[PDB]
Amino acid sequence: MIDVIMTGELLKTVTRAIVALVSEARIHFLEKGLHSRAVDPANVAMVIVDIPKDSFEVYNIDEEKTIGVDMDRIFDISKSISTKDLVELIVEDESTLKVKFGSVEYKVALIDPSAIRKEPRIPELELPAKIVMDAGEFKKAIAAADKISDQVIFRSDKEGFRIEAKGDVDSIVFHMTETELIEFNGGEARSMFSVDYLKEFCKVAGSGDLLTIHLGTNYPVRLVFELVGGRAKVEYILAPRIE
């Protein structure tokens, strides 16, 4: 029914991204490619993973199928898979997932998809500011901010993009102008977010990876990571802090 072959890097990316918010997830094998979305139990953050069929070395499906996966077990297993190694995912029967790489075959019981928490709805967000930067830089900014507060402000206007954190005795400001950013629409936006979710999000990205920020005023933020040289897309949506 399902027989795909991907790189270790690709599989390790999808699993890590998801495991950040949920333990179990529905994985969709569409004509288009791999797709998986989840909302953490808090309903504060959402993750959207998209691996287009082109990215796969092999991508064979008979029909579009959905499977219930234990992400904690797949994640734990993917640590044994090398970055440059090739991994084969196979679904013959409707109860077990086969994961092949090297001389190792791993079999795991699938979860009844109806047993997993209802698949989330992709929110319709109208967001003025659009920021494109290096995910690595962003990661360093969040880490710096983390030493000051539990929360940061994402500020945007004609001057540029800012990440700011305030403590009782100190503060930190990350600032980049249109010149320094890869792409910037100079949109006006100001929202506040929890540093803890942001750190967790950044775990799936590094220097060289592209990050697209969709920002509004007291609205959720869209953090679109383009990883594995544009072969995988990991989007995180985070609800803001108000009042």
Query: Which of other proteins, a second copy, none has residue 103 at its interface (CB below 5 to 8 Å by kind)?
Result: a second copy
List residues binding a second copy (CB under 8 A): 70, 73, 76-77, 79-80, 102-109, 137, 140-141, 143-144, 147, 169-176, 180
Q: Which of residues 29-58 bind other proteins (CB under 8 A)?
A: 39-46
Amino acid at position 144, single letter? A
User: Quick one: which segment of 3-11, 28-36, 68-76, 104-112 binds other proteins (CB under 8 A)?
Assistant: 68-76
CB nearer a second copy, residue 206 or residue 229: 206
User: Quick one: which segment of 13-21, 50-58, 105-113, 137-145 binds other proteins (CB under 8 A)?
Assistant: 13-21
The sign one gets for the Cα dihedral 217, 122, 26, 86 is: negative
Query: Which of a second copy, other proteins, none has residue 21 at its interface (CB below 5 to 8 Å by kind)?
Result: other proteins
Q: Report the alpha-carbon distance of residue 216 to residue 189 in Å, rounded.
A: 5
Contact (CB, 8 A) for 10 and 97: no
The sign one gets for the Cα dihedral 196, 186, 46, 3 is: negative
Q: How does DSSP assign 27-55, residue by residue?
A: EEE-SSEEEEEEE-TTSSEEEEEEEEGGG
CB nearer a second copy, residue 102 or residue 229: 102
Task: State the Cα angle at 106 between 28 and 33, rounded to 5°.
Answer: 20
Which chain residues interact with other proteins by CB under 8 A?
19-21, 23, 39-46, 72, 75-76, 120, 123, 125, 150-151, 168, 192, 194, 196, 200, 219-220, 237, 239-243
